[PDB]
Amino acid sequence: YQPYRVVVLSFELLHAPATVCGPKKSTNLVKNKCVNFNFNGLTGTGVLT
Amino acid sequence: NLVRDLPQGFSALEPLVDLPIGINITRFQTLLALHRSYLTP
């Protein structure tokens, strides 16, 4: 007998650019040694000084 | 200094904004003001 409280989600991609996405976890910055990096999509390897 | 002209120097334009709109645009119109408001049907 006890009523509920319901919520719907419905996802939809289109020809428009996708503007709603999820969060992007990060990692702290390491200098003076050879590492991989990912700076906003720019991938590579090197020494950050 | 001169009212008529586009001048004869060089200067470049920085980016301001960027909007994810997804439309079709084939035409435009400026929207400038006046003093006495007229509406056309």
CB of B32 within 8 Å of any CB in chain A? no
How many Å lie between the alpha carbon of B12 and the closest alpha carbon of chain A? 26
CB of A13 within 8 Å of any CB in chain B? no
CB of A16 within 8 Å of any CB in chain B? yes
The residue of chain B with its CA nearest to that of A16 is B22
User: Residue B21's closest CA among A14, A36, A28, A49?
Assistant: A14
Instruction: Compute the distance between CA of residue B26 and CA of residue B28 in angstroms, rounded to an integer.
Output: 7
Length, in residues, of chain A: 49
Elucidated via? cryo-EM
Q: What Cα–Cα distance (Å) separates residue B4 from each residue in A7, A16, A33, A46, B1?
A: 62, 42, 59, 54, 9
